[PDB]
Amino acid sequence: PVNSFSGYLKLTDNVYIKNADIVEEAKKVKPTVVVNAANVYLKHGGGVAGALNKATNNAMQVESDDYIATNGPLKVGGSCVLSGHNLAKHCLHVVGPNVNKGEDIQLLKSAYENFNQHEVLLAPLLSAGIFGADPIHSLRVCVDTVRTNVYLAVFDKNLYDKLVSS
């Protein structure tokens, strides 16, 4: 693990952000930890999870299915560390709340608290895809909760611009 992050804008002492594809960042940066925004069953069917899984050539899904079949689902707000395959040493799969389905958005705090067990992480915003949390709000919880060094990758330029102006 090299953690050679570059080109990030510093938002706070420990939160940095970049308009970039998290998969391409992981390949460039060789992070110790890449974060996946997962569901409780680690079914990586779309969004960031699907992109990370595809970049591992489906190995992440094979490993995740085996973990879940033995251990049962994660809790919302919870996480688990699995292999990072070719993307990172470790993948921290974190489950933000599915806000659109009625899960408590306060669980974003719990979800980001999992980042505090790692010195440095490459990560997406949590719950900011199909789970329906306002990305501005998700960033705010991240800033207010995470105390270790988080390098956030935001794919869409318009969203990045909105986040950086907020």
Which structural traits does this protein have?
166 residues; 6 helices; 7 strands
Explain what the structure shows.
It is found in: Host endoplasmic reticulum membrane. May form homohexamers. Interacts with N protein. It is a multi-pass membrane protein. Residues 2-166 form the Macro domain. This is Papain-like protease nsp3. 41% of the residues are buried. This protein has one domain (1-166). The protein has helices spanning 22-29, 47-55, 59-71, 107-113, 135-145, 157-165; strands at 9-10, 15-19, 33-37, 79-83, 90-94, 120-123, 149-154. Helix 4 packs across helix 5 (135-145). It contains six helices and seven strands. It is α/β, with parallel strands linked by helices. Helices cover 34% and strands 19% of the residues. The strands form two sheets. It has a four-stranded mixed β-sheet, with helices on both faces. It is globular and about 45 Å long.
Percent of sequence in beta strands: 15-25%
Strand order of the largest sheet: 1-2-7-6
Give the count of structural domains: 1
Instruction: Give helix % range.
Output: 25-40%
Supply Rg: 14 Å
Number of helical segments?
A: 6
How would the global form be characterised? globular
Order of secondary-structure elements: EEHEHHEEHEHEH
Distance between the first and last residues' Cα: 32 Å
Largest sheet: 4 strands, mixed
PDB class: hydrolase
Keywords: hydrolase, SARS-CoV-2, macrodomain
Assembly: monomeric
Entry title: Crystal structure of CoV-2 Nsp3 Macrodomain
